[PDB]
Structures are given as structure tokens and as C-alpha cells.
Enzyme design. Structure first.
Site, PDB file in Angstrom:
ATOM      1  N   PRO A 117       2.389   1.208  -4.125  1.00 57.96           N
ATOM      2  CG  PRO A 117       0.396   1.389  -2.965  1.00 57.96           C
ATOM      3  CD  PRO A 117       1.798   1.958  -3.005  1.00 57.96           C
ATOM      4  CE  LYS A 161      15.330   2.360 -15.943  1.00 51.85           C
ATOM      5  NZ  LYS A 161      16.026   1.416 -16.852  1.00 51.85           N
ATOM      6  CG  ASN A 164      14.726   3.128 -12.494  1.00 51.74           C
ATOM      7  OD1 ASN A 164      14.394   1.911 -12.481  1.00 51.74           O
ATOM      8  ND2 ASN A 164      15.978   3.515 -12.817  1.00 51.74           N
TER       9      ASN A 164
HETATM   10  N1  LIG Z   1       9.679  -0.086  -3.732  1.00 48.86           N
HETATM   11  C1  LIG Z   1       9.068  -0.554  -4.826  1.00 48.86           C
HETATM   12  N2  LIG Z   1       7.723  -0.737  -4.832  1.00 48.86           N
HETATM   13  C2  LIG Z   1       7.142  -1.279  -5.899  1.00 48.86           C
HETATM   14  N3  LIG Z   1       7.705  -1.697  -7.024  1.00 48.86           N
HETATM   15  C3  LIG Z   1       9.045  -1.477  -6.993  1.00 48.86           C
HETATM   16  C4  LIG Z   1       9.767  -0.922  -5.979  1.00 48.86           C
HETATM   17  N4  LIG Z   1      11.123  -0.885  -6.302  1.00 48.86           N
HETATM   18  C5  LIG Z   1      11.179  -1.449  -7.469  1.00 48.86           C
HETATM   19  N5  LIG Z   1       9.950  -1.816  -7.968  1.00 48.86           N
HETATM   20  C6  LIG Z   1       9.612  -2.313  -9.297  1.00 48.86           C
HETATM   21  O1  LIG Z   1      10.522  -3.346  -9.722  1.00 48.86           O
HETATM   22  C7  LIG Z   1      11.150  -2.938 -10.952  1.00 48.86           C
HETATM   23  C8  LIG Z   1      12.602  -3.365 -10.982  1.00 48.86           C
HETATM   24  O2  LIG Z   1      13.318  -2.715  -9.922  1.00 48.86           O
HETATM   25  P1  LIG Z   1      14.711  -1.975 -10.222  1.00 48.86           P
HETATM   26  O3  LIG Z   1      15.224  -1.563  -8.904  1.00 48.86           O
HETATM   27  O4  LIG Z   1      14.492  -0.931 -11.283  1.00 48.86           O
HETATM   28  O5  LIG Z   1      15.549  -3.212 -10.819  1.00 48.86           O
HETATM   29  P2  LIG Z   1      16.859  -3.081 -11.741  1.00 48.86           P
HETATM   30  O6  LIG Z   1      17.237  -4.426 -12.125  1.00 48.86           O
HETATM   31  O7  LIG Z   1      17.814  -2.220 -11.014  1.00 48.86           O
HETATM   32  N6  LIG Z   1      16.334  -2.312 -13.107  1.00 48.86           N
HETATM   33  P3  LIG Z   1      17.307  -1.548 -14.171  1.00 48.86           P
HETATM   34  O8  LIG Z   1      18.683  -1.428 -13.490  1.00 48.86           O
HETATM   35  O9  LIG Z   1      16.570  -0.271 -14.349  1.00 48.86           O
HETATM   36  O10 LIG Z   1      17.368  -2.348 -15.385  1.00 48.86           O
HETATM   37  C9  LIG Z   1      10.997  -1.423 -11.005  1.00 48.86           C
HETATM   38  O11 LIG Z   1      11.034  -0.922 -12.337  1.00 48.86           O
HETATM   39  C10 LIG Z   1       9.668  -1.203 -10.342  1.00 48.86           C
HETATM   40  O12 LIG Z   1       8.623  -1.447 -11.294  1.00 48.86           O
HETATM   41 MN   LIG Z   2      15.244   0.075 -12.859  1.00 48.12          MN
END
Ligand SMILES: Nc1ncnc2c1ncn2[C@@H]1O[C@H](COP(=O)(O)OP(=O)(O)NP(=O)(O)O)[C@@H](O)[C@H]1O
Ligand SMILES: [Mn+2]
Ligand SMILES: [Mn+2]
Lengths: 343, 20
Positions: A117, A161, A164
């Protein structure tokens, strides 16, 4: 610390045994879509959309990452999404996000993690400007322990970053986005990461190793204490141009101990790079910049966090930006079923 | 000041991973 170095070595020998058992036997389809009520989008990325969700049968909220299989395919992320899931269910450290369930259906792949959170560290950093050296050090120490843990399991993380890194209830970090994470003993060649954080060896189309993560930590410590990344511009082409040049300018307010450590991490010659030398991680851990850090207390979460986020009950999402909501369609036909059979 | 040039840049918002 001698006795403590032995305790760490012995710890990691045993954690490795736990990692291997789960890596060799991955858990599959631990839930289905309809057990969850989709509240709102916590964040998005180049690949996925994470949503705040509630379990209908248990009243419990989680964060669910959703990936569209047709997009995983067009973006060349099949093997990466399979690594992401396989590694994340096998890992177990205080600073990494917990994978509760995963499953897929005709259209998508779903990973259901513990909802963290406090927001992205990104949020808090940009609002406040920059963190103080002792605040920056508190978080750097968490990532130092995380990388020590991951690298001993033969894993490179590859997307360090502030976006993440999330802030929990206690003010302690939880690393999310395992999308580029990979178990590899030799060299690896995929051009992957985020622009500002890319080590010059990735840019240069050289094989690379776990040193890329240590470069990324240099970039992260610089960004947390200056409030801007060491290499910036408007276009990615300009940042890369800057990375490879190797020229770093530190703000006047950075301590000489901070500048010393960063010159050691932001070392363009992967040979001279701290974390990649004969001593490895102990170079970073025994740096004068971390002389005050009690590595054991941080591991045990015994240190009081410089910043605690406030929430007003569960599913309370005030710590996250608002995003446009998309409806998620599930096709009547299974898409790319062969490529995702192990997921 | 460097903070000023950074705040006026194009990449001060959330940075997504490279995919192309
Ligand atoms: N367990 C979690 N709890 C809360 N928010 C989360 C959690 N995991 C991911 N998020 C949020 O969701 C966003 C996107 O998730 P992410 O796993 O980074 O997606 P992605 O598409 O792999 N991003 P990227 O590869 O960095 O362009 C993250 O930057 C966090 O803000
Ligand atoms: Mn990400
Ligand atoms: Mn990602």
C-alpha cells in the site's frame, strides 16, 4: 562480520536449497478470474496493468498483474514472462513482493501478489524532491541485501528503478516487476531494462553478467540523493550517448563518502566495478558510506524507517496515481496456448 | 541549476521499460 560473514554464507547455502525445490517444481493455476472483484488500477507499465482486487470468497485484497498474451507475443516477451513467474514463485526474501497465486485463461496471464500500500518510491521521491543521505542509505542497504540474495541464486534482476520499488506499511521496500529477471550462470545478451538505468555493457551489445545490477544501484543511489538521475535527456538516444561517455557530475551537497562509492559503482569498466570484484558485495558493504549500517537489523526489520506511509483502512489506494480504467475482455478462443503451457 | 533543467525535461514522469 567474520562470524556474521559465516552466518550469511550458511544462510544463503540453505536458502539456495529452498529456492531449487520450487524452481524445479513450479506451482501452476492456483486461482481463477471470477473469485476476484476488480477495484482499481494501481499502476501500469510497458507490458502489464496491475489492479487492486478483492477475493470474493475471503474479503482479502491483493495486487493482480494482468498480461495480454497477444501483447507478450508481439513484444518478444514470451521467455521473459515465463522467467518472471517461475522465479517469483521460487523466491523468498523480506524485501521482495509475495506471489500468492497465478493463472491464465483464453486471453491473459495473471499473477496475484501481496498488495503493497505505500506507493512507488517514485511518488515520494518526486513529491519531496530528493532524500537525505541517511534516508537514501536506508533504502540502498535493502537493495544491497536483496541483490546479494538474488545473485547467489544465479539471478540477475535487470529493472532496478524507483517505479519498481514499493513502500510497505513499516516503510520498508518491496521489489516488484520480475519481468526481466533471469537465472543464468554465464553471460546474457538481451537488450532490456529502462533507459536511464542501462549499464554501458548492455548498450554496447556485449554479453553481461550480474554487474549490470550494481551499475543500476549506482544510478538509484544517485537519483535518490540528488533528486534527478545522473544521465538524463529528452530522448533515449541522448541518454545512451551519455551513459557510454562515462562522465558523472555530482551535486555539491553529496558527501565525499557518497561520491566515492558512486564512482566505484558508476564504473564503466565492469572490471573495476564494485560488486564485480574478487570480494564482490563485501566491497559495497564495507564501504565507508555504509559504516553506520547494521546489516543484521535492516535484514530483521529492527531499524525505524525514516518515512511511514499513512493509509485509512484496506484498499485504500491514496498512495498511488489514478489511471484510466480499461475493461478486460476474455476471448471465446484460447490465444497462444502452446507458448504459455508452463505458466 | 541541474534540478531546473531536469524538471523542464521530457522524462520526469514514470519511466516504462524498453520493449522496442
Ligand atoms: N504488489 C504490488 N502492489 C502494489 N502495486 C504494485 C505491485 N506490483 C506492481 N504494482 C504497481 O503496478 C505497476 C506496474 O507493475 P510492473 O510489474 O512494473 O509492470 P510492467 O509492465 O512490468 N512495468 P515495466 O516493465 O517496468 O514497464 C508498478 O510500477 C507498481 O506501481
Ligand atoms: Mn515496472
Ligand atoms: Mn516490467
Amino acid at each position: 562480520k567474520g562470524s556474521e560473514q559465516e552466518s550469511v554464507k550458511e544462510f544463503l547455502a540453505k536458502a539456495k536449497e529452498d529456492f531449487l525445490k520450487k524452481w524445479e517444481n513450479p506451482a501452476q493455476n492456483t486461482a481463477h478470474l471470477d473469485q476476484f472483484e476488480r477495484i482499481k488500477t494501481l499502476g501500469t507499465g510497458s507490458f502489464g496493468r496491475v489492479m487492486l482486487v478483492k477475493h470474493k470468497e475471503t474479503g482479502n485484497h491483493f495486487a493482480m498483474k494482468i498480461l495480454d498474451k497477444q501483447k507478450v507475443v508481439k513484444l518478444k516477451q514470451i521467455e521473459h514472462t515465463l522467467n518472471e513467474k517461475r522465479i517469483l514463485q521460487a523466491v523468498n526474501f523480506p524485501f521482495l513482493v509475495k506471489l500468492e497465486y497465478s493463472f491464465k485463461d483464453n486471453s491473459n496471464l495473471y499473477m496475484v501478489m501481496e498488495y503493497v500500500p505505500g506507493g512507488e518510491m517514485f511518488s515520494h521521491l518526486r513529491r519531496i524532491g530528493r532524500f537525505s543521505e541517511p534516508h537514501a542509505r536506508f533504502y540502498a542497504a535493502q537493495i544491497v541485501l536483496t541483490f546479494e540474495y538474488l545473485h547467489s541464486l544465479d539471478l540477475i534482476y535487470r529493472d532496478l528503478k524507483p517505479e519498481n520499488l514499493l513502500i510497505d506499511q513499516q516503510g520498508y521496500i518491496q521489489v516488484t516487476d520480475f519481468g526481466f529477471a533471469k537465472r543464468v550462470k554465464g553471460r546474457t545478451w538481451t537488450l532490456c531494462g529502462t533507459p536511464e538505468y542501462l549499464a554501458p555493457e548492455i548498450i554496447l551489445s556485449k554479453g553481461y553478467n550480474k554487474a549490470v545490477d550494481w551499475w543500476a544501484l549506482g544510478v538509484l543511489i544517485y537519483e535518490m540523493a540528488a533528486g534527478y538521475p545522473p544521465f538524463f535527456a529528452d530522448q533515449p538516444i541522448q541518454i545512451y550517448e551519455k551513459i557510454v561517455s562515462g562522465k558523472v557530475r555530482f551535486p555539491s551537497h553529496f558527501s565525499s563518502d557518497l561520491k566515492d562509492l558512486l564512482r566505484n559503482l558508476l564504473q564503466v569498466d565492469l572490471t573495476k566495478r564494485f560488486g564485480n570484484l574478487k570480494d564482490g558485495v563485501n566491497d559495497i558493504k564495507n564501504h565507508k558510506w555504509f559504516a553506520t549500517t547494521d546489516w543484521i537489523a535492516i535484514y530483521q526489520r529492527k531499524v525505524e524507517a525514516p518515512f511511514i506511509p499513512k493509509f485509512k483502512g484496506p484498499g485504500d489506494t491514496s498512495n498511488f496515481d489514478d489511471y484510466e480504467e480499461e475493461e478486460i475482455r476474455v476471448s471465446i478462443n484460447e490465444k497462444c496456448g502452446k507458448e504459455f503451457s508452463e505458466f | 541549476t541541474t534540478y531546473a533543467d531536469f524538471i523542464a525535461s521530457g522524462r520526469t514522469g514514470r519511466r516504462n521499460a524498453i520493449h522496442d
